[PDB]
UniProtKB/Swiss-Prot annotation:
Subunit structure: Interacts with XPC; the interaction is suggesting the existence of a functional equivalent variant XPC complex. Interacts with PSMD4 and PSMC5. Interacts with ATXN3. Interacts with UBQLN2. (Microbial infection) Interacts with HIV-1 Vpr.
UniProt-annotated stretches for the region HIV-1 vpr binding: 1-45
Organism: Homo sapiens (Human)
Phosphoserine PTM positions: 39
Coiled coil: none
Residue span, UBA domain: 1-40
Compartments in which it is found: Nucleus
Superkingdom per UniProt: Eukaryota
Identification of the protein by name: UV excision repair protein RAD23 homolog A
Family under the similarity heading: Belongs to the RAD23 family.
Domain description: The ubiquitin-like domain mediates interaction with ATXN3.
Function summary: Multiubiquitin chain receptor involved in modulation of proteasomal degradation. Binds to 'Lys-48'-linked polyubiquitin chains in a length-dependent manner and with a lower affinity to 'Lys-63'-linked polyubiquitin chains. Proposed to be capable to bind simultaneously to the 26S proteasome and to polyubiquitinated substrates and to deliver ubiquitinated proteins to the proteasome.
């Protein structure tokens, strides 16, 4: 499973949904998943 990284990805200030899709679309990687969630441009709006 990847549930281990889920709380990790979430711990960066994200959410288990954007996390899963950022760790499944990233082919369950590490530096890739982080890069996904951190590269997901999203401000006030």
């Amino acid at each position: 499973q990847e549930k281990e990284a889920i709380e990790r990805l979430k711990a960066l200030g994200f959410e288990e949904s954007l996390v899963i899709q950022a760790y499944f679309a990233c082919e369950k990687n590490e530096n890739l998943a982080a890069n996904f969630l951190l590269s997901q441009n999203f401000d006030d709006e």
